[model samples]
Target: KSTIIYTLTDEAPLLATYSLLPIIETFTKPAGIEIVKSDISVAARVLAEFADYLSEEQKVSDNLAELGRLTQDPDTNIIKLPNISASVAQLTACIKELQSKGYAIPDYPENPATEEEKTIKARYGKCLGSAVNPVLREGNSDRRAPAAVKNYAKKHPHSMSEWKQWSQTHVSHMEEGDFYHGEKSMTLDRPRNVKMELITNSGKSIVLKPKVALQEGEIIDSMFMSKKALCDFYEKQLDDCREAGILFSLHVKATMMKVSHPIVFGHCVKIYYKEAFEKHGKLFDELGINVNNGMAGLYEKIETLPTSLREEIIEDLHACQEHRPALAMVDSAKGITNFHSPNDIIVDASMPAMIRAGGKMWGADGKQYDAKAVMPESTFARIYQEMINFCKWHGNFDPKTMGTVPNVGLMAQKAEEYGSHDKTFEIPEAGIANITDLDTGEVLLTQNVEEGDIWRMCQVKDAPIRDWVKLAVTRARNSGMPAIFWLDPYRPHENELIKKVQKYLKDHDTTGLDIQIMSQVRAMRYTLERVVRGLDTISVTGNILRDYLTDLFPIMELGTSAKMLSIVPLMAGGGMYETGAGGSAPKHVQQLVEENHLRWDSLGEFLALAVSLEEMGIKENNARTKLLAKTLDEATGKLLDNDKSPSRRTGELDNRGSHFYLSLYWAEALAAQNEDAELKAKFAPLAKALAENEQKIVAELAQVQGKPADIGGYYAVDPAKVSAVMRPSATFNAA
Candidate 1:
């Protein structure tokens, strides 16, 4: 055996030329050379084309990086593997195959795996298939690679359609979506040339007619605008939703795609799919998804303006009450969850308050939902993931985090829908469908109450008296927004309240069967157990203002069984005060004593909850603390701060943060009621100021009490609770 045996060799020269045939042929073609240059222009064109390819690659890279930036699962912030191992393996195999061929192997850097760089690059190749192949170690290539993937996209029409549908972000992100989570966006600013003229068509000069022409820099009213403009805004939003994957109904309601039968060798996929596609396409068109831009435009334009201005504008714009913005809910059509109405005020970027009727929360079958779930760990995680995703998707500059998002509205709805651990109760539906009055076409606002109900009547009568609440309940059963009666403490029994309510309604001949009963202080009464059992089926209602959170939270914890709650702020205590040189400030005096009461109640209940029936209320303690601070701030805002000179300033120091009035003091000492010197020295000036303005405070409170019920308790601490507590509590005061 010869040790050095030469391998058999066929030394014939193989086709050795670089594969430049296509490039050379294109250049040599008579038409190509004359029409398209082969020098600077051609080279520049190629360079630009190459740059475009690179830009596309960069975009794809950024998107994949966004997908991979955090290894934590979106819903659960736990680690998840990228799961691109198989793709990476296939890429390595492809590379080896390429290297085995005699073509010079380019030195490409090996990209190791890490959580940060997780991407689809292994399948697409790390260079992103840029025209200048990195593996080839060249700036340019004469030949392009044959389309390797066969563009399977065309073969799978159904999947292609799905991809297009899933492109909308609102639909994909629906379960945990957000305010700024729009996937599609447009330059929202549209300037117009605006001119107003008083013109008369009939009798006298009419009000201003706003003539608006699209211009470069014309100011537009954020509150009131034409329907065409609104629709344009909405259409832009629809475009964005279509671009984002979250607009799911348009993309993924799971339509029947195909019909199948035996005996055919090949299978059918898209004939029935065509019908499904056409059907959905028509449905989507009719629903005005093409025109609606999500809910932001309507919510902000109609609801964000000042109440007076909003009402006036609506009155002016709408032809009839039926055409009112409150009743015309565009989002109510489909796929909208939680408490959302057309009149909801989109306050800031993150906060939107539902106006008009508080939305009912229930399962599909109408059962109350959980209140505690609002801030549960799972919920917090979901919110965090949603916000993070929202930021990435929207490229938000200053994004919101989990803890800050005010979830009161969402919480209220959940409580209403699926209260207490998925236990659902079918709230008896109040039927007003065919219950129109024969005498007058006017729809009854309540059982016998006027369109506008007062806070005093709601509290003193409905809160404590059982008999007085029957008509209120009946009104709730029939009215568009079920009329709710928030009861207070030390009130009459349920039966007495009911009788008073029945008599009041009967006197007015208000026959309606759609009313229902609701209570605000039921949870408060539950803790006292002072020979009083709160409403057996009562639920909480009223504002999203955090100032009133104390009243709502206790209800959430204690009355888990009660479903449906409302969260609207009450503006009571709005007035002017002079906080200078011991001027009496009305709100200040009210603050001092109210705080002590709150603390006493809170500690009493907290102790009860903590150590077996000590009757403590720590939550109430916190509320009072917050309330005192809020009241002081309200007072400070009204003080005249016109003075400028330091020595001769009319303004007082910022004592807004200081809690006043809990402690009492006198110049000398005594028992039980002697003024403590330390306390007197601290807040005496503020107290004196409040004392002087006592009448103003009283007048303010009275006005608040009588404030047309539409705008009640807006500035009070827990408006619902205050409204429940303040209105004359003897009961039997309905209508």
Candidate 2:
């Protein structure tokens, strides 16, 4: 049977699914294709984990795990929508929402002190950060700008600010003391059980990570950040930025890299107000003011203190601002700094947005200024620096002329650092952290760490690297563009992958092809230089760079990263089609709730669906499926050409209206095609009906805006309410 497992995700994409899925079902059902719905939202995944404690009515299946297993099967086909890559705050909020709705889920422990609380927090942590992607991405990523979307962008270019050559905007990362500096990695000679132990100077030994199961040839690494070194680096950069008269901002993915980056971000907060922290360090500690959560945590913790003491802390924070460089504001009007929360300034999204705004971030005064972007880790931080340098040298990328930089990412089976959730840890005390072989009693890797240092282990299996290399070569040969492996030879892990890439290249023919290896900085520069010249290039990268660059380049070129086609060719001969990046999807949901308007673009879904259908067609040799894919693509292009996109205004066409036009154009395409007489006959009358009542359908959809809607919940909305809210167009519904 031909089955397509389409996930019902969160926010705008899920709301859109209420209207869009019915239309999809109507079309696909006729061709004997079964389209099943699977809920993988934050709420559903959480409910699934605690299903044993919940009532039968409240219980949900572990669909994410099922999908993960399916990724290894040949018949598996999934069309995945964008869900919340949640932060701790977001996850906690969802837990509360689910608790209110009669689910017996435990509360997320903010500061766990007890053994029971630690166990509970660990369970909830599974649903935090990147909870879903590592499980289901059983293949390397193949992300590109679809031709229709590329053409649309060229015809209707998005606004881009001009970059000045003299702009003081630059990236500042730790030259030492960071993960890239203090690192050791090696591929295992045999399968081994290892334990992470910390040996104190006083001869006390404590096991940090009790046990880590390693496979044969699995690459594992040990790395740490020096607390003193990081603090000194921040002090120097703060002063340098103040002297340079540039804005000083910090960018960290505290939300995704939850444990490490938050600790890194805390160092910036403490150093930025060194005098305040030093003077009141004892009082703050007594108040349980953990700055790792950000300065917001400090402010929140001080609320219950004496008025005089609270004022003193506030005045101290203000006084420190006098000598400090101007800080970038996350919210200018509300006076939220970049240090508000680790979740506030995510590097993958923020850096591109800043670069798009002409290498400037908003100040506390609501004005734009060039800023010193501080990223603690030099490993991936250099990529952003290279981008800023490119913008400074070549001006902003031209949407109409700039070529696409597609990414072939290694992300299969939790292959790299982002997938190392269980291995990541916060250093407890000044000690020696070692990865010791349990069987042999020998240390595999060791690191000297201090109190408050962020230390962790990461792994990449041999199979994923070999698969990643093959995917890169295939993309390079197919696209007729040069493929550059963005791996730094100086980095121990990349050095290992580089060897495998070299070994893998021999398996494929290289006639008339340009496949080269370069460091991350060099690769970013080369890609950007070619991008401005309207020459396409393929970036072959590891898991982390893959996540970073895909967002970085697409937002610059297409105005929104959500419009790219992200296809994961499952290693087991299945397919996993991912929709657009949902960075702004939360804001869209907020808009919908405040005023009934959804500005979420469904272009990524449209692109992914076309490819999914086409791949299924080719695999099953179903002519109808192939024809449907072909005409659906034509309909999509027509939808773009005719400007049938969701509008920002209340009375204008929203997501529902845009969907109507797509259906109308798709019906027209189906009716016009000659490949299948039955399909053409069936859709011809429907196309005429939709065309005749086009204004009526749009008017029906548009009239539902400018009023508050009840979608039941944020993380998990009531399906009935969603249907009532999203499917308001009776004219379109009747057709």
Candidate 3:
């Protein structure tokens, strides 16, 4: 009774699943493995959250919550695919499709003026940014490029541009009034309930969060980003960028942070278009246009205005741009600038992308150029500059000779800033923010704040920190590589973590294991020094770096982080395999919609499924199941070797064609294996059939390209129509 839950997610992955899952199911069935699918896509999550509002037939079960419960079960094995984090714009688009389908769900209230709308908005929050990962991840992350993918990449390297010494591209961050600068942290002496409240200068106590029950020995911090300081920082950076005559770009994790980063992003956009906003501020408010959502919303809102007024607004926006530095273009052909959308210029996604492209950003002319990458928060922004510094001085790293950087991330229970959304707030008045003990009425931590300041508390339980340290130690001992803990002593949150890491290291047999604690910059330099010398090192970092380095190193080393093998050895005794969740491509989805061809590479899926099946076999003591894993790996290797993966260009071998090749190679592996006669006999005919019709299958897949594909809607796509659209090859389908 071995069951593995395969997540059905959004966009291209979901479309690919329609073709791939059938192939997976057929192979896994003989091994006594049950393949169960749970939909956690953006569309499904919305329906799950608003089930009470829908009619009986229109209602949907809470699959995400159901999946969350299974994380606690010891036998739980999940093959988790990347799902949508659902930014406000993405969420609104999802609502539009759902409403058009007549689900009776209310619109996503942008500015909730009433208590009921606020409650409705609060309910919708469950389906917003990073909803799936925090709820389902029951253990820490161990991500690395598999041996086959690593070797394959080394043998056939991707293009890498060399960084020039005089490149103006550099990272900028706030010196003060950031979360890092204003942070205060302490380890809880005992289990206590605390309430976050604002004690105004006028003598009124306004409660923001009523109670947060904390555990004994838990680490908590109180931090705020001052609006005044943030505005001034943006002003200075914009002016400096303009003076330097470089393209100006703003990068923040608006999708992940959901609350604070959007405001942080909005401030930069507002300050950049300061004059236009100031003149139209009153009317913009009357129109219910939200700047925090970005220029996409503003442009969409003003479309309903009179023709002359709309032209004037566009002219005013262009007028601001004339005085400002050239903005980096997300899509040059479409004329979409960095200020077009907050989600488009995300830090973690854009940084590695820029770094990989030799520290160059896309310009308005559709050519790459050195740009001022403005990240307001100094906390994580320092790493990009350090890496950039290395690239410029030492030259581009060679993948054929460079060593690997595997990561041990501390993200088990939504640790650190990932869990801050519910607790985070934008201050409304001049007051002293306090984290007061609900039981004792004692002020545990406090900060003086002015109006419009972003304030929040972050917590990491003692157990997860201890586990993170232990995991790092395990990786160090196993790989025989130096494991550097990227913890800054100057920061309050990490200082507390450093204490626990030191305490936890004592619990392990660390006689010969090489482990050291250094701040981010020093650790990065140390790691880069080793990386170029073909020396392996494990990066032991918190949620941010875990997310950061996995993309940073893997993208540099393997040409794509999608090739990384992500395994979570659950503390409760099972294993959860994650793939493509760290990085997503909405562009891949758009291509499929416009071109009728999907170029999504399913290497992560292939890797994840192999690991999932292998682990299931080991746990259940099934040799044949182990053989299936071995064969799948063989097929995966051959697929990479043959370059059967999907191409970025349409009319080439797309996702469906890649699946055909994967299936052909896989069945051939199964048929050729001497260890399993039962499987050999079972797959021999299918292998023969596929091989004989290889040209026909390839022809069928190639012919389906260069046409518009409509599966009913963008967010909530029609399943039968998608199957028809994807599985266009009748010869391949029949075989």
Candidate 4:
């Protein structure tokens, strides 16, 4: 019974699993394995998907649908982290902070107008946005950067940003109606039963998405966007970024695309404040001022108006930000612009931190410029205008000689179109929509939308597009690199996954490799022109450009895409792993509760617990878990060659002093292993008492750093005050 579960997710990787899951249960509890723990927090998955509407000390165990039926079971291993895909204002601030800690639970029906608020807004819309990755991904993604985080990013490299070719930053998208110019897709053939409907060009008929269920070579699709062609393409890109004067930003994910990107980021905040939304469009619809929850809900709904009509709507939003252009600033010292929230301009974490800072962002005079990004989804905004036209024709990339691109993606189970949030929608007037089939009523897929259109429907199936084209021809014949496939045949779901990835690359035997299939802007200009000369490629996207090119090339070669190595595999064979990129886990749990530092980077959970103990030592043959996963990948390359990570202030070395130097370099590589004589006599007296009390367990984990930590609740915390504020090392918690 070799177990491993280990989820317990949320900000800062579940408080660094209260001090690295007791140093990974003192090294996999004598190697029999086990691990366990589960939580899956968005407040324990809303107290286990409303445990019959709570109480009884708020019931709590649907352990995310029992880890989504244990990822279809094959003795699942799991690891997964990075949760809280929540966002309708973080699910109404986690239902008013779990209803002021009491936890009766309900409340999240934002505007459901009865039938018991539409059955409590269909059980809190199953806990919102990509909720637990379309029920535990099921599998796919491979991700990279590992080899001790790419040799500690080529021996400590990072800082890059120097790009020019007359910068005027780029990417604007939506040439026509969006959703990649109205897609259509198909595939199916047999196992049918569809629905979706709409019809309405005034002869009514609505039924939007009644059922769905397809199969025979899956695929499906049907897209839309055109709210008068996205408000005349955001009034011609805010009047061509105010006549080519740059800095205007916009990018949008709206927190994991929660409802068609906050109504396409409220039509670019009502066309960049088109005459202050046409003279306060009826007092911003009588103060229910949504603005798709941006412009901070129209300055918190005009503070209940009437102070000279809220100073004439804040002087018509500062005279429409003085003829629009310089917007950007997702926090220019709390001024917070970039339309201020649809989860603050998220397009795959703000277009790779604005193409690794060279194509800049911040503005309200706080500096950094060259902007105009915008991105109203020309499906994957043409891969950030193919990396802003390869960083203005090759100028940036060179994290000490760039190369590694990684990513395999096509996320299993919820395979494509970002798990189509139960067939997305919005339009409510001049329509057509369709989908039909339901035992051959035919109309397979359609669109032609209008009244504030957005409309959707997506699917992938056919065994995860034939297991993402045989894991992109087995990662292009085992990383000989040169792979590509980013697909795009004018986007009808990548012309039916490029005809099943050209009939699964003729069942793989690509004699002399170098696979093809381009069009994500010619595979991002053929992998950023072989990533600035150094070479390495692979990509094989889908599943939202594999969550934005695995955080756009591991934050441009490891200056933090949370130390890569994500893996998944489990198409019912089991093994999930995944760890980092919590996108600065809420400012590392707000600087660990305003003081006690964290800077959460457990190097992608020590490289996904050393490939999840070498996939449980090649499935339980367990040569002492393959010599404790080969001395925990030599103690994660000596915890990234001795810098021992965490840091970012307050008495230094943070995440509980980097899990006590990764349990003192994984107990000195299991006491200098010799193929583990009883696991080096059970880690030789804890590696000689952690190399003789390593500075007294790092001064009892840096003397509880600056202070304030009672971790009682930030989305249901209080796990015994987060194990006494993450185990403040009482002499290394009485090792």
Candidate 5:
């Protein structure tokens, strides 16, 4: 009757699960609560997507889909972790890894041309970008830093670089012809089915999207990014960066905006190497040298060619480099540039990392320098620039006195750009694009477009908007802070949303709550003003901003947004608890493969389950379960205070030993609790046993360090071996 669904994700988070899951089972079982491990790893998602090609034993369950259904249960308490948001290259590598391990999965079709190839691409498409987020995000987001973590940061402040007023660094976004400038949006008058179609100048008709069943009172938008305008914007930005003596960096949330940003990223790379691409345009396509995957993919494919011909291509590339501005580095030691991959510089992660370090990015010269961050979409880009302006006018935020900015995001039902993937199209020919009612044959919206332009539709159900507004008011009333919805009036989409916000604000009794709506830039300005004065504010934003600012404010406060307690109190009834993923799990994973160390912290997991257990306790009204949540949080604070966190270096107290310390602290906490007498008596010996065996267990964990640890495969890793290698401490395992 009592259960918590714990997600098993990829890389370090999944590896940590091998050791931590068993330990939790023992504690939860004693309280008649079951901990269910749901494998929603990108690897599992891949197998689930291709179940038709696999043997019965090899076919994986669609755990992601199961949880999507679980949302309506209302009593489902799920603890989710960070899963892989794969790009084409990353997803391709994963498929290759699995195929090599004996899975008969077909290779991903890069340039899917034929109808059959396009069908496979469609299947593969589901695994790409931020596919996992909205599927399970059936509830709006309530994400923020826990007070204890905030207190820890204030007492022991993390480093923040000072932003000089005269610094050359700034954010550059398209002024026109981008998604923001050309968008058309409206709230539906009634429920209807629609299709995205294009009519050519010569009277040819092509239906891009056959049908979309829209709901009544839904906010829908049609937008396009002009190829000509986008390329021109990059040319100007590139030249400006070169002339101003600053590095040129492209910041894109390509992983989540999988379809749009990848194309957006491609234009920058294609234009940067204009002459080389122009000369090799025909031959480039024949050889599959897709610069969309970046220079690395081009380099990877070119390596298969004859050395002399490859040399000719490299020479031309070098020639283009001479005229082009220097690109920011993803890895300077390996000569990996920002243009190496679209996945390399996700705006959510990269912008925060860059701004935190004083708006500087690593150049190929292996040194930091002020850089021009080009964010193609001006929609959310202005917020970063506006914040940068604040940092320059004031200074970098101080953790000791900086106020917290929690986010109440409109994210349910793929509400907004998240729903655009399938509807998105790369314009094949110069034409007029229209969103027409499928049955009525009436055009809902129309736009002039060009061949090679990116056009798409986005939607948000009325229910999510109403729910988001209520959450914003509830958050404001409870937290006693002003809540500002960062909506821009100039942007058509937010303009439509603004009307809904005002309508929904009337649904709740927001009598005493300080809730106001403001433009994105103005809202940010006001928020930062209060933030510098140590006054807290709740930011009510859309999906994209939620993902970005969820990290932005926290990274400013905690120096790493690795542990926010995100709650999704569902409209259907229950809540789901999600934790922060620095979105850098791969870094930790690769480090483990090389040095036998995992610098990944499981504090997020501890906190996620504490809230998960606590909520379910309230659901069941169980004192023991509530006590378990309290003690688990107490143990987490003690874990941080005692510095039992996994250190970066190998042979140090890594994740295993860190787990032992957490177990020790939690055991001690459970034994000390007064109300749970039976639990107290039972845990006393367990606490004594763990404390007594600490040094031995610590040594047992450390001995596996300083050596390469393999777990069969990269993506589809063997679970038996992962458990064997990860749970190396026999003495600890015995307990």
Candidate 6:
């Protein structure tokens, strides 16, 4: 089929395809550099000083290739030249200088430096170019020029298409010309070699049947510039828009299929910003990864941890524990997309991360795999290698999890005991990080997803691997350890939704309630599914946060969760740890906070899940046996029901303080069983509050809810007012 190609110069004379050779060379491996140039006299002088060095540098190519791979990873930032230029230059120089030291000097051309030889400067003589700039700023050119260019292109559309050809696609530099679809392929559960292409339209088309194998009903399609592409271009234009820090806009169309939910898109943007800031954030150096992220708390003392703390809290955990054999286990979702997946081990020291770029394998030693003479690959290995290569070209390693290697390294050091050599360790078996409800300290019966728990994910500073796992597990057990932890699956498909939601929120326009309705519908759907599955949504979500913690726990134990089915914990933290009603944060803001909260508030979930175990009343379980269950039951009744408690309500075999604090009561029960008076004393305040003025709680709850705005934004809310509006009413408020 015949198709049109646009030319760069027809309408805009300044439209020349700029070659980014200067930047591209930063990622290049040796194809044997040649000193090709503009052939100017001055160029000859530079070449004479650098020719022999290029060949010599290519000889010892191992480190050079690794550095190149890192530089080219898809998410790498070239726009922040000032920050990264030094590292790039140092790496490039390492090659050039080493090469020059080995090679013999070449004959001098024009002005020679003493007896100098050639280097990389002598190798690609001229910087290549692409992208034409007519006027530096947007719309600075002739007013009618853009329309004229389009009209002229309409007349000679084919030529115009040719001009926009780009000589290559996003992967033009990559052999075979396409990037890998890592998560997509995995999500669809397809075998390797399922070809995928990113179809872009700039009014250029030549062939379709060959590039894309079509099914019967499939039609040729093109999307307007994609958000991914647009973002890519945005990075490219940062130098031009350096001062503006221009607000990003979505030109998304109906056909684009990458992301589907507005919340997902907005969250993704937030992630991008977070990632960008973290890497470059040292410029500000305000807070490192952990504290700012709200992963772990800034505790004053070990006792009386803000609520649901004990159930999930694991102290002195080292990052090294992440590599241990026995760990907390649960089903995992797609790490980046939040799509559901089968159960996987939480911490298997033996299993290397399959998604890593280097395809790194760990040995007895902590170092990554060495080539051992460039071993040949198997069919499966070959496919996996290709995928890694494809993703590396796209930017960094594929999933956001892999991006934490640097942070992981830091965390490992913090939790690991100095000079401890005991290699074998057990997680839940040893109760290092037992799962429990964050708010109530009850063991979750099923998994639940919290609205805003992401804020808890922070990079522990040199923390031990085991400790991180414990913390992670603690977080998961708090809410609900559902079989699967669903974070955000729609991010890859919904850019338009994000933009609309953002706009609506910005205008404070809740008029049509489009965004609000959608939000409510999703909540309702999650709730309905929670109930249908015979799962306790309240335990899973409200304050347990089981989903988040389960992912981390199970992955730590076994290399893969497939064998375990699912060791889902529950979810938590839908309310402020102190105030409930999720407190002052807005729904959107709360969501953002939750996502980031993974680092700190995770303890709440851990404590909550443990409480579930107490509430479960399953004496046969080991946890109950360990707590000396019978002894604690009598002790708890003695403390609360001193006066026979009016013969106890019928059918109430065991007393539960309140549904909201089931985890807390269970924690107290466990403490009683374990005969720890100190632990019992820690929860005395809450118990006293529940007993005193029990009747007035409803009146106070109404008064609190009636007020507009958080009675002073989560901090200044009157303590009396909060208790009055939110306190439990009659009917026991018991479970």
Q: Report the number of the highest-TM-score candidate.
A: 2
Per-prediction TM-score to the true structure, in the order listed: 0.17, 0.87, 0.81, 0.34, 0.83, 0.19
Output the better candidate (5/6) by lDDT: 5
Query: What tens digits encode model 6's per-residue C-alpha lDDT throughout 427-479?
Result: 11111111122344432111111122110001111112223233233333433
| Model 5 stretches astray by more than 4 angstroms | 7-15, 25-69, 81-135, 278-289, 297-317, 320-324, 579-601, 622-626, 647-652, 667-735
What TM-score does prediction 5 earn?
0.83
Any runs in candidate 6 off by more than 4 Å, and if so which? 1-585, 588-660, 663-709, 714-735
Per-candidate clashes come to 91, 0, 0, 1, 1, 169
Cα RMSD of all models vs. native, in order, equals 35.7, 4.3, 5.2, 25.8, 5.1, 34.1
The lDDT, on a scale of 0 to 1, for candidate 4 is 0.78
Candidate closer to the true structure by TM-score (higher is better), 4 or 6 = 4
Task: For candidate 5, write residues 1-735 as lDDT tens digits.
Answer: 677888888888788777788888877777778877798888889888888888888777899899888888868888877778888688887878866778788776667776778888887888988788777767789998876588788888989998898888999999998988988989898999999999998889999898999989988999899999999999988889888889999999777687888888888989999998999888888988778778888888888889998999999988987778888999999999999899988888899998999889998989999999999888889999998888888878888998999999988877788878788999999989999998999999999999899999999998888888888988887778899999998888898988988888988888888899999899999989998999998999999998889988888989877778889888876788877655746888877777677765677888888878877786778776887788888888878888878888776866677777878888887877787565765766578789777788877766766567777787778767866567876787777
Return whichever of 1 and 4 wins on TM-score.
4
Q: After superposition, how far is residue 473 of candidate 6 from its true place, in Å?
A: 16
Predictions in order: lDDT:
0.21, 0.84, 0.85, 0.78, 0.84, 0.22
Ranking by lDDT: 3, 5, 2, 4, 6, 1
Q: In model 5, what is the error at residue 47, expressed in angstroms?
A: 10
RMSD after Cα superposition, model 1 = 35.7
Can you write out model 1's per-residue Cα lDDT over 366-454, one digit (the tens) per residue? 33221111111111112222322332343321111101011111111111111111211111222111111223433211111111111
Compared with the true structure, what per-residue lDDT tens digits does model 4 show for residues 1-735?
Answer: 688878877777788877788778778888887777888778777776777866676676688888877877787787787777787887787777767766665675556674878887887788887677767767688888876777667677888788788898888877887887778888876888889999998778899888888879888788887788888888888888989888888887776678998998887888888787788888788778888878786887788876897888889878976777778888898788888777867788788888888889988878888988988777787777777777777777877777888978787776777679878888778878888977768887777787878888878888877777777777677668878888878777887888988888898798879888888888888787787787888888888888888888888888667677787777766678887645535877877887777675676777788878876786767887777776777777877678777778777776676677767777776777675467765676666677677887777666766668757667776767767667766777676
Ten residues in a row with the worst lDDT in model 3?
Answer: 676-685
TM-score ranking of the models: 2, 5, 3, 4, 6, 1
Give lDDT: candidate 6, residue 162. 15
